[PDB]
Amino acid sequence: MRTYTFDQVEKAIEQLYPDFTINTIQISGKGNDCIAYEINRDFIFKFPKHSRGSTNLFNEVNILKRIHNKLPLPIPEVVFTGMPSETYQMSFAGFTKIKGVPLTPLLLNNLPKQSQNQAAKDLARFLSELHSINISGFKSNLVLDFREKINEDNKKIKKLLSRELKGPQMKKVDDFYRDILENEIYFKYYPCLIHNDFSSDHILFDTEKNTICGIIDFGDAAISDPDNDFISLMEDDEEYGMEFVSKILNHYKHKDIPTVLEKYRMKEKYWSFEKIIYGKEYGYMDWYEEGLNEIRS
Numbered sequence: 001m002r003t004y005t006f007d008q009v010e011k012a013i014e015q016l017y018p019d020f021t022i023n024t025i026q027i028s029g030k031g032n033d034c035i036a037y038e039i040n041r042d043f044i045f046k047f048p049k050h051s052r053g054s055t056n057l058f059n060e061v062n063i064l065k066r067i068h069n070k071l072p073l074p075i076p077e078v079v080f081t082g083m084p085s086e087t088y089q090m091s092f093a094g095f096t097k098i099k100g101v102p103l104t105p106l107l108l109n110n111l112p113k114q115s116q117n118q119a120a121k122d123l124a125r126f127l128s129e130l131h132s133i134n135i136s137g138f139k140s141n142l143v144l145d146f147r148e149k150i151n152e153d154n155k156k157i158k159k160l161l162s163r164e165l166k167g168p169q170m171k172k173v174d175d176f177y178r179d180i181l182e183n184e185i186y187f188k189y190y191p192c193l194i195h196n197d198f199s200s201d202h203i204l205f206d207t208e209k210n211t212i213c214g215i216i217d218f219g220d221a222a223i224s225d226p227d228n229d230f231i232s233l234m235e236d237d238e239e240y241g242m243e244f245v246s247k248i249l250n251h252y253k254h255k256d257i258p259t260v261l262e263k264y265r266m267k268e269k270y271w272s273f274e275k276i277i278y279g280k281e282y283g284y285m286d287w288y289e290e291g292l293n294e295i296r297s
């Protein structure tokens with residue numbers, strides 16, 4: 001997990017774009033993979049915090065570029081690109097800023113039942129279109145082999161929980177990894193392009209028109225189960241309700257909501273194991289302990 005100063009950032013941009021003038025610069029946000037800088041008022045630059053971050057940055061650029069004018073809501077446009085380095089596919093990248101504020105659940109539930117439904121309608125239209133873009137030209141690296149992932153995780157988990165679990169706990173885990181892997185509902189799906197981190201903080205809203213005016217943060221975008229773009233909004237309190245996601249599902253004409261519900265349940269259980277893995281990948285001891293705790297109950 002590496003760090004940047006403001007001058008390091010200015011320097012990094014100047015050296016590739018010497019004729020770009022930075023008048024103002026502020027940190028607008030930061031996640032696991034990237035720190036984000038608001039440049040002038042018009043641009044968001046992401047700098048990666050590690051190798052994997054950089055790859056996901058690279059992946060965001062290529063995906064934004066290839067869907068640039070293809071969707072019914074605005075989305076970031078790539079304008080500046082950085083360079084490969086030793087272990088980083090992409091030293092930085094610079095995107096247009098999209099006007100709007102996050103469509104928090106709070107902001108959502110304070111909208112009249114009308115503007116609520118329009119937002120649900122508009123989200124279903126964005127998703128339908130995202131999940132319909134033709135996937136044929138996309139390289140294997142831009143897809144998620146989900147069974148390969150669960151197996152990858154399974155191995156990692158054994159390496160890490162060797163010596164943290166009793167054999168009978170470690171077996172309650174084996175049984176979970178096999179209950180999943182012997183269930184085709186998780187893998188028998190029409191893969192398509194997805195946002196894959198589709199959540200209220202990445203949905204921008206125009207309070208003047210009380211309409212959605214943007215979608216951001218395509219770093220995790222990949223070719224995968226279209227259901228994942230609904231499951232990421234279902235969480236109560238943190239995200240929208242279950243009731244609201246049904247509204248979206250129906251404008252979207254999803255023909256099997258109970259399967260979506262089942263995926264959601266699994267996902268929630270599964271998060272303890274991801275916390276463990278990511279806790280170590282990223283160096284979040286707290287995530288690691290939380291994961292360990294939930295597992296022990």
Ligand SMILES: NCC1=CC[C@@H](N)[C@@H](O)O1
Nearest residue numbers: 197232235238267268271
């Ligand atoms: N359910 C917890 C949860 C899962 C997805 C994660 N990105 C987390 O932020 O919320």
